[PDB]
Amino acid sequence: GMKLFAQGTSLDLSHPHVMGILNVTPTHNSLIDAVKHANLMINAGATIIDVGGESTRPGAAEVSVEEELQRVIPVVEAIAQRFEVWISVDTSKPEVIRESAKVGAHIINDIRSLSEPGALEAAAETGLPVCLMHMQGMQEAPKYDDVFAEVNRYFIEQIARCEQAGIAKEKLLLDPGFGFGFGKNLSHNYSLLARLAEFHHFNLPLLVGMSRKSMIGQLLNVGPSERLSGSLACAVIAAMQGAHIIRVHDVKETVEAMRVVEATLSAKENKRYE
Amino acid sequence: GMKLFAQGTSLDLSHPHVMGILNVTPTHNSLIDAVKHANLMINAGATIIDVGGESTRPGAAEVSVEEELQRVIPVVEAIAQRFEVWISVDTSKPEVIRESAKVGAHIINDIRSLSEPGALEAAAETGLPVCLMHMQGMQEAPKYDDVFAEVNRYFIEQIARCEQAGIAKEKLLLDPGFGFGFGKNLSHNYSLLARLAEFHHFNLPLLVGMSRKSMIGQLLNVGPSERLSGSLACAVIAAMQGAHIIRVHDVKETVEAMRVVEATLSAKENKRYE
Ligand SMILES: Nc1nc2ncc(CO)nc2c(=O)[nH]1
Numbered sequence: 001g002m003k004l005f006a007q008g009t010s011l012d013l014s015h016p017h018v019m020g021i022l023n024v025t026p027t028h029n030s031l032i033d034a035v036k037h038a039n040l041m042i043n044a045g046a047t048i049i050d051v052g053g054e055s056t057r058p059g060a061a062e063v064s065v066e067e068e069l070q071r072v073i074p075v076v077e078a079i080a081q082r083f084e085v086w087i088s089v090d091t092s093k094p095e096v097i098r099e100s101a102k103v104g105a106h107i108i109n110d111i112r113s114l115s116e117p118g119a120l121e122a123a124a125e126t127g128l129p130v131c132l133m134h135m136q137g138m139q140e141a142p143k144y145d146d147v148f149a150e151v152n153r154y155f156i157e158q159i160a161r162c163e164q165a166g167i168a169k170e171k172l173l174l175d176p177g178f179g180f181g182f183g184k185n186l187s188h189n190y191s192l193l194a195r196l197a198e199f200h201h202f203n204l205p206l207l208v209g210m211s212r213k214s215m216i217g218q219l220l221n222v223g224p225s226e227r228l229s230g231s232l233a234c235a236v237i238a239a240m241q242g243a244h245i246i247r248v249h250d251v252k253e254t255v256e257a258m259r260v261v262e263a264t265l266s267a268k269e270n271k272r273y274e
Numbered sequence: 275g276m277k278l279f280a281q282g283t284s285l286d287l288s289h290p291h292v293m294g295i296l297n298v299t300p301t302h303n304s305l306i307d308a309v310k311h312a313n314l315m316i317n318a319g320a321t322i323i324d325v326g327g328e329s330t331r332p333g334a335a336e337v338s339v340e341e342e343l344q345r346v347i348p349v350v351e352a353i354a355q356r357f358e359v360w361i362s363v364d365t366s367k368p369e370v371i372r373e374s375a376k377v378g379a380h381i382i383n384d385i386r387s388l389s390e391p392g393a394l395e396a397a398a399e400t401g402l403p404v405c406l407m408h409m410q411g412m413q414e415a416p417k418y419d420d421v422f423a424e425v426n427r428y429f430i431e432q433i434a435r436c437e438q439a440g441i442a443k444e445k446l447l448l449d450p451g452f453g454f455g456f457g458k459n460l461s462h463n464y465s466l467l468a469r470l471a472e473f474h475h476f477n478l479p480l481l482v483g484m485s486r487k488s489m490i491g492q493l494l495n496v497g498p499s500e501r502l503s504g505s506l507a508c509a510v511i512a513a514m515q516g517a518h519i520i521r522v523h524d525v526k527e528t529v530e531a532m533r534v535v536e537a538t539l540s541a542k543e544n545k546r547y548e
């Protein structure tokens with residue numbers, strides 16, 4: 001029943017949506033390969049595309065302003081021209097937010113939740129949906145009084161901060177920030193996955209992304225390439241609880257698992273596992 | 275907290291157990307390959323082994339008595355000699371039940387729920403745990419007043435029938451009979467998967483097996499070899515609800531998904547998703 005609206009089109013969150021990842025970093029063949037990877041993800045079943053001109057996993061470098069315009073914008077521009085899928089942009093600079101909205105972007109997905117100077121002001125001018133994600137800080141993960149309580153308290157503060165800028169509450173999306181890069185260890189990560197359905201009291205969409213993360217690599221004791229089954233198990237658990245968007249690397253397999261989730265949630269009485 | 279007891283050892287159903295499938299049908303190299311496949315499944319994480327001298331998927335042939343002794347018994351006998359895993363036997367004849375219990379079998383897993391003449395009497399003499407599975411009838415699946423109500427009513431009748439023979443209720447195991455070979459179509463199969471946790475009112479173990487079945491092949495529209503992701507999604511849904519044994523073909527991936535399930539059920543408040 002929950003819908004997202006952007007660029008004269010809608011996203012019906014009645015079923016779980018799979019959002020494929022498309023990193024555009026180290027440009028002649030960097031654009032052909034981007035359109036072809038995006039094409040492959042659409043044919044596998046992806047309904048959203050996460051174009052991010054920055055890798056910020058702990059220990060990754062900084063990208064100046066002009067650098068992100070040169071890769072994010074032509075990629076975003078190329079997707080909307082030829083495809084129907086929704087395009088989310090992983091950017092924190094206000095200039096990339098303004099230019100992504102011009103070339104046809106749908107969702108503003110900021111890893112920093114629009115904390116950079118001018119970022120929140122830009123995201124409101126675009127009128128686009130913004131995804132708010134929680135994060136604390138290659139260093140360690142801090143200590144919490146209770147990881148679920150603080151993430152919740154981080155939200156109420158962020159929704160209130162959004163509405164103060166003109167971004168209506170109905171445009172927002174929430175993401176707990178799974179991963180040992182946003183300041184949460186293995187116990188904190190699995191506590192959030194276990195209590196995900198409680199986050200629905202906000203009555204807002206739940207973007208979730210745990211694809212190939214450390215919360216699967218450390219538990220299963222496998223390299224970064226053998227984490228498919230664990231990522232699928234994570235995605236099903238989140239979708240079983242009513243997560244609306246699942247941000248994954250392996251789109252074909254995730255989409256297959258989602259269809260089992262839908263066929264399961266369709267026969268249930270209340271469409272959600274608590 | 276629920277335990278199974280057989281052959282002087284125990285099975286602690288505090289975590290989901292993965293039961294690998296080992297079919298012994300069309301014998302010189304048929305035994306080496308059986309021990310080696312069983313070995314591979316143990317190293318992948320399987321704690322139970324399903325040795326079945328019969329394939330009875332719709333359209334499969336009949337095996338005489340002496341034929342099953344020649345393959346089931348030496349295979350069961352070979353596993354208990356060299357490995358610690360539990361051995362379940364897919365047999366309906368009373369003679370194979372008596373001889374499997376002699377060579378070291380753990381669980382009597384009858385696809386027919388001991389309906390053959392003399393089968394129930396044998397399973398009681400062994401004192402072993404029996405798995406009761408529901409089934410109606412290459413033909414079609416019948417019409418139900420309500421598929422959950424009848425399967426439940428099929429149980430109460432079967433537990434009562436077991437106790438009348440001396441098989442204590444604490445030795446029994448239940449299995450809904452997922453699959454379009456036991457008389458249940460795509461809607462009936464997903465109704466049972468959606469309402470699995472309700473079956474716990476019996477306070478008994480839940481054996482579940484949907485590996486590579488038609489309820490995944492028909493929904494995803496893929497050949498019998500590309501059903502891994504859908505089978506993993508099914509297994510997680512059942513384990514999320516508290517299924518205790520998951521009967522799968524792909525043990526390494528299932529075991530990986532179960533560890534995510536355990537790590538998730540460990541951080542939850544009540545260890546079960548309803
Ligand atoms: N919304 C969202 N964005 C992310 N971006 C990057 C990374 C990791 O680099 N993770 C996430 C995530 O988990 N959720």
Ligand SMILES: Nc1nc2ncc(CO)nc2c(=O)[nH]1
Pocket residue numbers: 330331364383385405407449451452453481482483484521
């Ligand atoms: N317990 C159990 N046994 C089975 N045996 C055979 C087959 C299919 O040949 N399925 C099952 C099953 O789903 N559960």
